[PDB]
Amino acid sequence: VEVSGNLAGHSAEIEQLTKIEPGELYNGTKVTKMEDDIKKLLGRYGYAYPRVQSMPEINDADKTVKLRVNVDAGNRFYVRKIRFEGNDTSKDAVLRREMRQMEGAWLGSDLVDQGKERLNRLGFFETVDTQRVPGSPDQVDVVYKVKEGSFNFGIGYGTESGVSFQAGVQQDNWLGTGYAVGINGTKNDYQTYAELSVTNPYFTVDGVSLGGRLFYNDFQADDADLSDYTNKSYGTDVTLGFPINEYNSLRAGLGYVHNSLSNMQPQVAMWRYLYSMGEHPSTSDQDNSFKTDDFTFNYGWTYNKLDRGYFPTDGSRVNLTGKVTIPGSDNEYYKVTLDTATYVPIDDDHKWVVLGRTRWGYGDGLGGKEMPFYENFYAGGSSTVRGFQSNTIGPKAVYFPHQCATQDGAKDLCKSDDAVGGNAMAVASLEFITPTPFISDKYANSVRTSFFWDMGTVWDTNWDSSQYSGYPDYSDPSNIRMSAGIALQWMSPLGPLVFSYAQPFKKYDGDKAEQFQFNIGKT
Amino acid sequence: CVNNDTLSGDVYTASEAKQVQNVSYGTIVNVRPVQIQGGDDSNVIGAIGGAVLGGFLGNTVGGGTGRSLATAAGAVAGGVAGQGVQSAMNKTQGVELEIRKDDGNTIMVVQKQGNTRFSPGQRVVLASNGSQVTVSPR
Amino acid sequence: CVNNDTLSGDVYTASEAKQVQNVSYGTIVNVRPVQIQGGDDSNVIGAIGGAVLGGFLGNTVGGGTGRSLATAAGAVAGGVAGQGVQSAMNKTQGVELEIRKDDGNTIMVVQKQGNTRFSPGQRVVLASNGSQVTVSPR
Amino acid sequence: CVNNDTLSGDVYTASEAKQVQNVSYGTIVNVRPVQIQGGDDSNVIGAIGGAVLGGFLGNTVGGGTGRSLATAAGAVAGGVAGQGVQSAMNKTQGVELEIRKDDGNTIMVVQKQGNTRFSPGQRVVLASNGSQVTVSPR
Amino acid sequence: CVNNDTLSGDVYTASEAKQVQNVSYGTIVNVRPVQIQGGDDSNVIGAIGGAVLGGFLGNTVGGGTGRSLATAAGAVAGGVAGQGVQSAMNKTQGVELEIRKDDGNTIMVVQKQGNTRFSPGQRVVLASNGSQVTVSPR
Amino acid sequence: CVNNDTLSGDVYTASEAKQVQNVSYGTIVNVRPVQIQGGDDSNVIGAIGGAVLGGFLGNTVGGGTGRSLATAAGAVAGGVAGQGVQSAMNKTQGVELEIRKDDGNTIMVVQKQGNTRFSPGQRVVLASNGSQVTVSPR
Amino acid sequence: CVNNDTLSGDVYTASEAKQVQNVSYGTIVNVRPVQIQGGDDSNVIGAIGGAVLGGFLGNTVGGGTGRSLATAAGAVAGGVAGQGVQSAMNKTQGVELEIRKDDGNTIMVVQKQGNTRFSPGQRVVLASNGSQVTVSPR
Numbered sequence A: 001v002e003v004s005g006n007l008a009g010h011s012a013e014i015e016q017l018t019k020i021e022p023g024e025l026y027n028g029t030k031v032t033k034m035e036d037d038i039k040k041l042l043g044r045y046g047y048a049y050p051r052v053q054s055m056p057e058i059n060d061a062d063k064t065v066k067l068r069v070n071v072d073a074g075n076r077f078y079v080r081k082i083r084f085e086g087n088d089t090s091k092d093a094v095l096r097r098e099m100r101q102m103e104g105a106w107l108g109s110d111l112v113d114q115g116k117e118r119l120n121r122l123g124f125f126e127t128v129d130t131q132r133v134p135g136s137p138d139q140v141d142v143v144y145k146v147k148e149g150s151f152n153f154g155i156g157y158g159t160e161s162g163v164s165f166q167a168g169v170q171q172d173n174w175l176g177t178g179y180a181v182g183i184n185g186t187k188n189d190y191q192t193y194a195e196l197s198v199t200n201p202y203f204t205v206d207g208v209s210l211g212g213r214l215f216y217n218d219f220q221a222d223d224a225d226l227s228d229y230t231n232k233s234y235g236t237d238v239t240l241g242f243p244i245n246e247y248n249s250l251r252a253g254l255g256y257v258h259n260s261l262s263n264m265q266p267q268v269a270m271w272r273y274l275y276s277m278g279e280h281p282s283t284s285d286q287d288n289s290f291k292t293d294d295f296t297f298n299y300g301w302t303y304n305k306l307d308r309g310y311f312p313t314d315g316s317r318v319n320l321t322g323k324v325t326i327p328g329s330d331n332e333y334y335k336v337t338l339d340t341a342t343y344v345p346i347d348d349d350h351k352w353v354v355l356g357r358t359r360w361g362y363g364d365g366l367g368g369k370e371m372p373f374y375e376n377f378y379a380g381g382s383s384t385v386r387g388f389q390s391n392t393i394g395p396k397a398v399y400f401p402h403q404c405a406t407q408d409g410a411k412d413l414c415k416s417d418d419a420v421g422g423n424a425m426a427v428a429s430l431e432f433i434t435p436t437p438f439i440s441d442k443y444a445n446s447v448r449t450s451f452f453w454d455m456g457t458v459w460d461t462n463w464d465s466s467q468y469s470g471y472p473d474y475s476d477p478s479n480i481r482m483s484a485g486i487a488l489q490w491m492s493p494l495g496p497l498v499f500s501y502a503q504p505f506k507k508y509d510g511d512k513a514e515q516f517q518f519n520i521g522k523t
Numbered sequence B, C, D, E, F, G: 001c002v003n004n005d006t007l008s009g010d011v012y013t014a015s016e017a018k019q020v021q022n023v024s025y026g027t028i029v030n031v032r033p034v035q036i037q038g039g040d041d042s043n044v045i046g047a048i049g050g051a052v053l054g055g056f057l058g059n060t061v062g063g064g065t066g067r068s069l070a071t072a073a074g075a076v077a078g079g080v081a082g083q084g085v086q087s088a089m090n091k092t093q094g095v096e097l098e099i100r101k102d103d104g105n106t107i108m109v110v111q112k113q114g115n116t117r118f119s120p121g122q123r124v125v126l127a128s129n130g131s132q133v134t135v136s137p138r
């Protein structure tokens, strides 16, 4: 080595911070690092500009390289003002933390080089650009510059609801203040969702996030293979949200829902519920309007670890959510939904992938009253447990003789096999992802496939078998439903695609099946 | 219960063990007592911990609508008390020490109170690192 | 039960085995006893493990809304006691060693107490690495 | 069960076979026994393997509400014992060697105990590589 | 079962067939026997293989709750025995040789035991590659 | 059955037909027979084809719960034997040839044994590419 | 069906048309027959194709569990035989040619046997591209 210049106190530490072993040949990395262990440090001596540049005498005859490290130190310059122009929403506060020299401190260009870049990960700048006090040679600034509502239309097709539309306007900057306002609208066989939504991501300067949701879920049952009941429901929820980890979050809020239960196909499973609340209309005729207004408190949690957003095969994803009313509304209940996700890659080459998503739920009515039936859990279908028709798993209802009708001589509980759902849900599925063959091996690493063994068990936690002999006890703890098969998912300029074929191997009588299902657009 | 129990001259964290730290000497002037704050300003946890406990306490009084009002007044009162007691349980007794290094200077450093009772005029050693300094006696 | 058993001179991590690391010599002055903290500042696991067991101990008393109060008060008390007890299974005894190297210097290094008792005035060998140092006696 | 078994002077990983690695020579002093901790500090795999076995063991006493308390306290005690017992099946004997290379220098290296027993004064050959060194006798 | 059968001077991988190999000459000193390991630290596949087979044996004792406990205790015991057995079918006998090249140097290389028997002093013909070396006899 | 058949001097990959191959001439020394491995070290395909055929061979015995034990023990045993038998369907004979080019050097190259039988001292016409070498006898 | 059909001198791919190819001249010696293996290492298309067809041929025997046994043994034997036949329809005859360019050199190249018959001693018009060559006879 050699030192030629004023280091202000690193003159001897060259062989300790910037050392190599003699005999090592001319390197552009392990000799430049000798330059670059004192090129960044010197902003810890208040020195603003640490300059290290070393130009050896490249000697070839008997091959020694005599390094000559001209290090001249900077000087002690300070942090007066941080100035952003053109942007009416970005703050001088968060755009200080995402840089690494606070206001009122010894300042340097080279040790603010740890700050300028991360400011762009806000997701709203196109560029993130980067002063001695104007005409005064001691105090100094750090400055930046920034360069800164699109419709969207969705049309899909499918098996669970066939046709499917989306259309809504998003504008993630309300007049220059960072509020995220977004609208959405979806229509298909059973529900039509037309929602407005707002958010302020920084309620507190430190991260608290407040969203107020105005939704409307004009739903319908018969087209969705269930039994008969119609729902036009409107409600509004508001939730807080505060970051805690960047691997976590948390939320809490107050949620008011209002439902119009009507047009019910008389049947025991819901007619237990009507009594306990206090409504007993005619037991075989369908002109009845049960109205609920539920206020309900809600909360959640989250976790993210995946490395790649698109076609992810790493990390671990989690979710929790619960809910409970105050005991001062119409129906009183609570609800607990847990979610999981895990993409385990076994080696760096990343062709073997392991995935399995566990989900749990449970609900109950508190003071002896019952969970509303439209809030139950449904299992079986394409998106959760492939092979069995959508919703088809869940202890079936029992139609009354209504107008099972008295024209044919119906005078009892006509046993039915129609899916209704349930209140305790548990779905596991272990999936074992494998390479993509049969296409050119140049690009045979894209179109994903997997073999899967999906289970699903919803039951009525309060269903009776004292009173129903000829029927089984529909609360069996191990009435599992496994299935297997295949399916191919990928990207193409016509949206998200997948095609499937899954054989239902295990099931019980009364459990329908659906071997084949597809997805284009959205499901 | 934020753990600011590492801010004494008699406790070290895990991250600064088995590492080389310089030694500088000095004498001491002007010890005086001072309190130390440690934690956050939002106190996002004490608020919830006081809020649920003050909220469930509402469900004990009244009935009908009179209950559903007390179960919110109690909730915000518990919310206030949660921060009012969490951030008053992070106070710690401590000291503020002027020292004159033998190198010729004077510096100030502040520490949590421990067992030893310093004096104005004594020899104390500065186990120095990259901008963390602990003042042990002798 | 975070494992802070690597902080002595009598245990090595697996990432410091089968490696070349230099040796310097020195003598010892001023050994004094010190406690060593470790691990997390938040104790997010002790909080959960305390909250659950504190909640399930609230279900055992009362009936109705008198129970539903206890099943939350117990939860908060268990949540606090969790952090309270977890940050008590990290207190580990240790020592603070000041040593004069033969090059002519002085440094000070802190290290978990083991079996051997260092003495005021002795010879120790400094096993050095990329800014990691362990002190072996003899 | 972590396998810190390749840290011996007697077993090589399959990534270090059929390779060219240099040979240096040296004499040896200062042999002392030291333990080796291998694996991760958090040690999460044994936490589940203790929590579940201590949770199902909680379903064996009492009934009603008194069974939930038991099968949660047993769960957290099982988790604690799990982390406590896994990190105590990685402890492995080892040696500290202070070798003088015939160049004229000194380095120390730590290495899992095998079968051969080093001595105070012996000739060893350093199978050296990019900072991985195995010390064999003779 | 890792197929660590390719570490012989008598079995080549298909990655290095029909490829050009430099040749050097040398003599040999100090043959000695050494075990060779391979694979991963964790042995995932053996873990699950142990866990499931040790779970389905758990079901076959008792009933009610005592079955539900044993089917988990057997599960974790089989899981441990997995890693305990998988890492036992990679232990392969082998040798470690240092050889004196006719250039005038010394290197040492480690190989699987084969049919050939080496001696201390023999004209072994190196095959070299991009840092892969085999030692053939005579 | 990973296609390790193109490692002879009598079969070419389609990737190197209609390309330019340099010609060198040389004489030959010390032909010796060797085996060649090819494919994977983990043998994933044999694992499935052993696992399913060991599973469905379990179902043929017992009933109740002892059925559910054999129908997994058979699966794991088949999984082991799968990797066991796949990596024995790739052991193929071969030769190792040291050859002296007219340049004045020596190299050795390894090939799959075909039908023609080399001799100790002959003439072979090297075909060279981007580090691929073949040996034809004449 | 792997398309190794563009390996003749009488067939060109759609990428090597309407592009300029340099022309050189030469004489010819040492023509000998060779087999060309063209396609993938895995044969992962006829492997499934044989697997499915070998499966459905399993349901057609036995009854009950003895059926469900055969409906898998047929699969892997059907699966394995799939590769064994697909790799038997990628074998193609071809020739090896030692051409002397009039530049004064020698190179060799192999091709799929076409309709023309090369001979030892003739004139050929080497067509060249970005390291791609064909040998038309005349």
Ligand SMILES: CC/C=C/CCCCCCC[C@@H](O)CC(=O)N[C@H]1[C@@H](OP(=O)(O)O)O[C@H](CO[C@@H]2O[C@H](CO[C@]3(C(=O)O)C[C@@H](O)[C@@H](O)[C@@H]([C@H](O)CO)O3)[C@@H](OP(=O)(O)O)[C@H](OC(=O)C[C@@H](CCC/C=C/CCCCCC)OC(=O)CCCCCCCCCCCCC)[C@H]2NC(=O)C[C@@H](C/C=C/CCCCCCCC)OC(=O)CCCCCCCCCCC)[C@@H](O)[C@@H]1OC(=O)C[C@H](O)C/C=C/CCCCCCCC
Pocket (backbone or CB within 6 Å): C060, D060, D061, D062, D063, D064, D065, D066, D067, D069, D070, D073, D074
């Ligand atoms: C080594 C080998 C492997 C390990 C295990 C192998 C086992 C092998 C053999 C097994 C034989 C088995 O048959 C035993 C059995 O379970 N036998 C039991 C079994 O029969 P089977 O055999 O199954 O057929 O079941 C029966 C069910 O019993 C009861 O069921 C009721 C409802 O069910 C009933 C009904 O309404 O009556 C009856 C039933 O027939 C059916 O009809 C149901 C129906 O389902 C719905 O109604 O209804 C519940 O009332 P509810 O629902 O309305 O609420 C009731 O809850 C109740 O009774 C509520 C109780 C609650 C007591 C709270 C204790 C917590 C201490 C923490 C404080 C410290 C603060 C920091 O409250 C009371 O009872 C009030 C009494 C006043 C005084 C009590 C003490 C107050 C505080 C003490 C502090 C002490 C300080 C020194 C519940 N008690 C109960 O189910 C039982 C309850 C009673 C208390 C026992 C004393 C334990 C003291 C230890 C603490 C030391 C403190 C320093 O036992 C328990 O909560 C166990 C809880 C252990 C939790 C872990 C400890 C955590 C803390 C330790 C410190 C680290 C029991 O009688 C049998 O027990 C009995 O025949 C009595 C006999 O003794 C057995 C009891 C076992 C407990 C041992 C645990 C100790 C070590 C822990 C090990 C991990």
Ligand SMILES: CC/C=C/CCCCCCC[C@@H](O)CC(=O)N[C@H]1[C@@H](OP(=O)(O)O)O[C@H](CO[C@@H]2O[C@H](CO[C@]3(C(=O)O)C[C@@H](O)[C@@H](O)[C@@H]([C@H](O)CO)O3)[C@@H](OP(=O)(O)O)[C@H](OC(=O)C[C@@H](CCC/C=C/CCCCCC)OC(=O)CCCCCCCCCCCCC)[C@H]2NC(=O)C[C@@H](C/C=C/CCCCCCCC)OC(=O)CCCCCCCCCCC)[C@@H](O)[C@@H]1OC(=O)C[C@H](O)C/C=C/CCCCCCCC
Pocket (backbone or CB within 6 Å): E057, E060, F057, F058, F060, F061, F062, F063, F064, F065, F066, F067, F069, F070, F073, F074, F077
């Ligand atoms: C070359 C070889 C190739 C093989 C195939 C080729 C040809 C074969 C084809 C046709 C022949 C065959 O069909 C014969 C047959 O199946 N015959 C059977 C067939 O009838 P059919 O043919 O259809 O007419 O099925 C019927 C089923 O029988 C019983 O049915 C009960 C329920 O049935 C009932 C009811 O009452 O509820 C009534 C019934 O009528 C019906 O209604 C059903 C209803 O459907 C639902 O309930 O219910 C179950 O009780 P449950 O519900 O509560 O569970 C019970 O399982 C039970 O009760 C629970 C059982 C299970 C315990 C297993 C644990 C042992 C640990 C081993 C480790 C050693 C040391 C640690 O436990 C017991 O039964 C207690 C026995 C103790 C001894 C166990 C062996 C251990 C020995 C070592 C000990 C250490 C000391 C040295 C079950 N027993 C049973 O189903 C059988 C059970 C009995 C134990 C066998 C003893 C010797 C085995 C030697 C093996 C290793 C030893 C070194 O065995 C088994 O489950 C299989 C055991 C597999 C072990 C594999 C180990 C892993 C290997 C990995 C290698 C690396 C039996 O009648 C026939 O067997 C009998 O009439 C009695 C007979 O004697 C036993 C049967 C033979 C099994 C052995 C073969 C396995 C080898 C491995 C295969 C890959």
Ligand SMILES: CC/C=C/CCCCCCC[C@@H](O)CC(=O)N[C@H]1[C@@H](OP(=O)(O)O)O[C@H](CO[C@@H]2O[C@H](CO[C@]3(C(=O)O)C[C@@H](O)[C@@H](O)[C@@H]([C@H](O)CO)O3)[C@@H](OP(=O)(O)O)[C@H](OC(=O)C[C@@H](CCC/C=C/CCCCCC)OC(=O)CCCCCCCCCCCCC)[C@H]2NC(=O)C[C@@H](C/C=C\CCCCCCCC)OC(=O)CCCCCCCCCCC)[C@@H](O)[C@@H]1OC(=O)C[C@H](O)C/C=C/CCCCCCCC
Pocket (backbone or CB within 6 Å): D060, E058, E060, E061, E062, E063, E064, E065, E066, E067, E069, E070, E073, E074
């Ligand atoms: C080399 C050899 C190779 C082996 C090959 C062979 C393998 C297979 C062959 C087939 C034979 C086998 O089938 C035998 C059998 O299972 N036979 C059983 C089978 O019959 P069949 O198969 O049909 O023929 O099933 C029958 C049903 O069993 C019973 O079912 C009841 C419910 O049934 C009922 C009801 O009342 O609700 C009525 C019934 O009629 C029916 O209708 C059912 C119906 O299904 C639902 O309604 O309902 C349960 O009550 P519940 O629902 O309310 O819970 C009850 O469990 C109960 O009640 C609850 C139990 C609690 C037991 C658990 C605690 C053990 C401690 C271990 C760790 C130490 C802690 C630090 O409590 C009791 O049983 C009360 C006993 C009081 C005294 C306890 C003393 C133990 C203390 C030890 C302390 C040591 C300290 C150092 C349960 N007992 C039972 O199931 C039995 C229970 C007996 C109590 C303990 C004795 C031995 C303990 C050894 C521990 C060593 C300690 C160092 O045994 C067991 O739960 C198995 C326990 C497994 C433990 C695994 C290890 C876990 C910990 C790991 C530690 C490292 C039993 O009669 C038969 O039992 C019996 O024949 C019992 C007999 O007497 C002796 C059996 C010994 C077991 C040895 C196995 C161990 C190896 C483990 C492998 C991983």
Ligand SMILES: CCCCCCCCCCCCCCCC(=O)OC[C@H](COP(=O)(O)O)OC(=O)CCCCCCCCCCCCCCC
Pocket (backbone or CB within 6 Å): A477, C048, C049, C052, D051, D052, D055, D056, D059, D067, D068, D071, D072, D075, D076, D079
């Ligand atoms: C690391 C600290 C984590 C602390 C979490 C403790 C979990 C508490 C679970 C209590 C369950 C009681 C509710 C139902 C009671 C009942 O009688 O339930 C009865 C039913 C089964 O009995 P039936 O046969 O009568 O249905 O359920 C059970 O017995 C469920 C099994 C309980 C044992 C599971 C072990 C504890 C949690 C698992 C590990 C999670 C750790 C995750 C860490 C990352």
Ligand SMILES: CCCCCCCCCCCCCCCC(=O)OC[C@H](COP(=O)(O)O)OC(=O)CCCCCCCCCCCCCCC
Pocket (backbone or CB within 6 Å): A478, D048, D049, D052, E047, E048, E051, E052, E055, E056, E059, E068, E071, E072, E075, E076, E079
């Ligand atoms: C290595 C750490 C893994 C720890 C995992 C512990 C899980 C404990 C599961 C106990 C099962 C009892 C639940 C209900 C009992 C019952 O009567 O359940 C009833 C039903 C079936 O019984 P019937 O046939 O009588 O209906 O289900 C079962 O019996 C479930 C089968 C259990 C055996 C599988 C063994 C564990 C699964 C695979 C292991 C995963 C390892 C992960 C490695 C990282």
Ligand SMILES: *C(=O)CCCCCCCCCCCCCCC
Pocket (backbone or CB within 6 Å): B001, B002, B045, B046, B047, B049, B050, B053, B054, B077, B078, B081, B082, B085, B086, B089, C080, C083
């Ligand atoms: C460390 O301290 C973690 C924070 C835990 C929060 C502590 C909350 C204290 C509870 C006070 C409740 C006062 C109730 C008053 C209602 C009128």
Ligand SMILES: *C(=O)CCCCCCCCCCCCCCC
Pocket (backbone or CB within 6 Å): C001, C002, C045, C046, C047, C049, C050, C053, C054, C077, C078, C081, C082, C085, C086, C089, D076, D080
């Ligand atoms: C390693 O030391 C961390 C262990 C993980 C947390 C376990 C802490 C135990 C919690 C005890 C809860 C006591 C409840 C008291 C009720 C009043």
Ligand SMILES: *C(=O)CCCCCCCCCCCCCCC
Pocket (backbone or CB within 6 Å): D001, D002, D045, D046, D047, D049, D050, D051, D053, D054, D074, D077, D078, D079, D081, D082, D085, D086, D089, E076, E080
């Ligand atoms: C490598 O050894 C990994 C093993 C991980 C689990 C080891 C077994 C620990 C479980 C012990 C649980 C005891 C609970 C007792 C409660 C009273």
Ligand SMILES: *C(=O)CCCCCCCCCCCCCCC
Pocket (backbone or CB within 6 Å): E001, E002, E045, E046, E049, E050, E051, E053, E054, E077, E078, E081, E082, E085, E086, E089, F080
């Ligand atoms: C190569 O070896 C691949 C791994 C094959 C699995 C081997 C693991 C064997 C599992 C044995 C389980 C024994 C359970 C004993 C319980 C007491």
Ligand SMILES: *C(=O)CCCCCCCCCCCCCCC
Pocket (backbone or CB within 6 Å): F001, F002, F045, F046, F047, F049, F050, F051, F053, F054, F057, F074, F077, F078, F081, F082, F085, F086, F089, G076, G080
């Ligand atoms: C190329 O060779 C791929 C081959 C795919 C695997 C075929 C191997 C057959 C596996 C036989 C399993 C034996 C069953 C034993 C049952 C006890």
Ligand SMILES: *C(=O)CCCCCCCCCCCCCCC
Pocket (backbone or CB within 6 Å): G001, G002, G045, G046, G047, G049, G050, G053, G054, G077, G078, G081, G082, G085, G086, G089
């Ligand atoms: C291009 O050629 C595509 C691949 C062709 C696949 C043909 C599969 C042949 C299957 C023959 C079946 C024999 C099975 C006999 C088992 C007893």
